């Protein structure tokens, strides 16, 4: 999947109920689970570390580069 073109890049991932987490990609699945490094909650201004997001928990992703 095109997430392969994103390997090890800082991302902005939007989730259900209007949530943004921004972290350098670490890997993905066929179910589009995403593991991120140094992820930041853009709502509360918190760097939340390495995360996994669920597939249907991914509305959109933008590439800040």
């Amino acid at each position: 999947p095109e997430l392969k073109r994103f390997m090890d890049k800082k991302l902005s991932i939007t989730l259900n109920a209007n949530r943004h987490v921004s972290g350098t990609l670490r890997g993905f699945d066929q179910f589009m689970n995403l593991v991120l490094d140094a992820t930041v909650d853009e709502k509360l201004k918190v760097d939340i570390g390495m995360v996994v997001i669920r597939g249907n928990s991914i509305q959109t992703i933008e590439a800040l580069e």
């Binding site: 994103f6 509305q59 992703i61 590439a63 800040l64 580069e65």
Partner: peptide, 23 residues
């Protein structure tokens, strides 16, 4: 070359976009 038009008319510049289809 992404132009974002938000629910409130907001126009934003995004370099790339990956869009889930069932969204």
């Amino acid at each position: 070359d992404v132009t974002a038009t938000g629910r409130d008319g907001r126009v934003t510049q995004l370099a790339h976009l990956f869009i889930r289809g069932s969204r």
